[PDB]
């Protein structure tokens, strides 16, 4: 319900800051992790790196799974003329075969003895699978910033922004705080390798396999879908006769297939884009952003702690609260020791500020190991929590 | 059955209702008249089968189901049901 939660329930967060200013700040993503960076008047950022998929990547073959015959046509020649041939032998989109037959008196030849024969079938692929090469470059990995602000929602999403290691050093807006500079790069996934599509579920496999497959096939750069490559895989042609030959296609091979690929690691995908979990290291600059909200009034009323203070997987808390006498204003945060002589702890959220009445304003901090007064507020109630963090 | 041509020879779309039956037709040299002994005769489809039904003069027939006995002929039928 509040900006900057997400990072603050995840398990995997790292803690980032730049020793020095206007200097890089490096800084590793990954899947289902969240990176804090932190700085100087500065404010308090998330960075998440959620997607990774490659785009449009190039076909390397098509392999026919299903096909159908119509228009087998039989044509053969009697012994001592020949070979005989068909015009459609020459169609690419017929499957055929020679053979010898014998023939004879029985069947329109003067002599006895074997003939030449020949059978042709138009072939039609009713399923097809692809198989695709990913490359490293036009892969595109998706980053999340989000402001640590703490503000609330249940509009105001982190910037997303998408990147290829072959895109420039980006420079990312963030409303109301300037832009943050940073650059990626795909820092070690593997790709002689190649990708399986069997209608829309996909797999990762091997090449040389891949290129061995017994099955029809087509060029990559193909459209016609026809002049499909070694049909005799899925055609049988059985023993022919005088005059005729039948010719049977095998059946469905997408189940040979499926049975086929147990074992090989599995590929999610959607919207026909292949899905991976990738890793990037990034450098960042902040000396474009600054705080939002400075230069307000130092709120001079009251706060509720709206709820049950909570405790974060990260050595911090995180303080709920709602003004109130006062403007859309700054808060008066401060954890001090018990008796507040000198300052402890530090705020993860920055210049924590209320926007309106009765809007819960979460607030992430940092309170010392062992006792301190978590000071929110000012003098009509200054709001003292006794803390203990073990 | 519809009497059309294959490269100038006499070709023979046959349907489901002719099974059995012998099949004739005109030509310059007289009448001729195919056997179509075709087991798998069945329904004109998308599958069919092509192939020639060979002169056959006091001959028996041998490892065939299709011949005329004036001028060859080849056949079409399909093997739907
Ligand atoms: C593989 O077999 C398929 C069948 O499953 C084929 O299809 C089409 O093939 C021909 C044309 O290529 C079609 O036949 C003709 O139909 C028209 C209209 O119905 C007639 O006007 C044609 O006429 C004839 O012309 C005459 C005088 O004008 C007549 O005296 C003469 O004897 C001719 O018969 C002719 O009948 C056919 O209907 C259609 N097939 C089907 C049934 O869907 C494929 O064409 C065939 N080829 C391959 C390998 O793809
Ligand atoms: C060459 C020859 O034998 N011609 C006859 C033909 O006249 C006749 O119509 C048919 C059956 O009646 O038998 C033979 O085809
Ligand atoms: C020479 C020729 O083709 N004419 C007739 C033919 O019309 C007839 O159908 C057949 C017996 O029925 O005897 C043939 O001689």
Redesign the pocket.
């Given at each position: 319900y509040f900006q900057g939660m997400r990072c603050i329930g995840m398990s995997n967060r790292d803690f980032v800051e730049g020793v020095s200013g206007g200097s890089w700040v490096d800084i590793v993503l990954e899947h289902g992790s969240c990176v804090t960076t932190m700085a100087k008047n500065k404010p308090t950022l998330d960075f998440e790196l959620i997607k990774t998929e490659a785009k449009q990547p190039a076909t390397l073959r098509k392999y026919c799974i299903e096909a159908k015959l119509?228009?087998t046509t039989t044509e053969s020649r009697c012994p001592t003329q020949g070979e005989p041939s068909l015009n459609?032998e020459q169609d690419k989109r017929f499957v055929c075969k020679h053979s010898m037959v014998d023939r004879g008196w029985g069947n329109g030849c003067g002599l006895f003895g074997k003939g030449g024969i020949v059978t042709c079938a138009?072939f039609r692929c009713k399923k097809n699978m692809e198989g695709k090469v990913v490359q490293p470059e036009n892969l595109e990995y998706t980053i999340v910033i989000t402001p640590h602000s703490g503000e609330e929602h249940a509009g105001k999403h982190g910037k997303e922004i998408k990147i290829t290691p072959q895109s420039s050093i980006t420079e990312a807006e963030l409303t109301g705080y300037g832009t943050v500079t940073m650059e990626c790069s795909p820092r070690t996934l593997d790709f002689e390798m190649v990708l399986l599509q069997m209608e829309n579920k996909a797999w990762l496999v091997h090449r040389q396999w891949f290129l061995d497959l017994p099955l029809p096939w087509l060029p990559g750069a193909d459209t016609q879908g026809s002049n499909w490559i070694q049909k005799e895989t899925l055609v049988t042609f059985k023993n022919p006769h005088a005059k005729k030959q039948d010719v049977v296609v095998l059946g469905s091979q997408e189940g040979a297939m499926h049975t086929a690929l147990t074992g090989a690691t599995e590929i999610q995908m959607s919207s026909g884009n292949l899905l991976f979990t990738g890793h990037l290291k990034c450098r960042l600059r902040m000396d474009k952003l600054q705080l939002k909200g400075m230069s307000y009034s130092m709120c001079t009323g009251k706060f509720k702690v709206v709820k049950e203070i909570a405790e974060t997987q990260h050595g911090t808390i995180v303080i709920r609260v709602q003004y109130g006498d006062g403007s859309p204003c700054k808060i008066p945060f401060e954890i001090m020791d018990l008796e507040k002589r000198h300052v402890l702890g530090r705020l993860i959220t920055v210049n924590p500020i209320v926007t309106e009445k009765d809007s819960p304003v979460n607030i992430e901090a940092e309170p010392p190991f062992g006792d301190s007064y978590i000071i929110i507020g000012v003098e009509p109630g200054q709001l003292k929590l006794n803390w203990f963090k073990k | 059955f519809?009497?059309?041509?294959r490269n100038g020879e006499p070709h023979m779309i046959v349907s489901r209702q002719e099974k059995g039956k012998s099949l004739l037709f005109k030509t310059e040299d007289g009448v001729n008249m195919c056997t179509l002994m075709a087991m798998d005769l069945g329904e004109?489809?998308?599958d069919?089968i092509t192939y020639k039904c060979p002169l056959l003069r006091q001959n028996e027939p041998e490892d065939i189901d299709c011949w005329c006995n004036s001028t060859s002929t080849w056949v079409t039928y399909g093997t739907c049901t």
């Open positions: 119509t228009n459609e138009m | 519809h009497l059309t041509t004109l489809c998308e069919t």
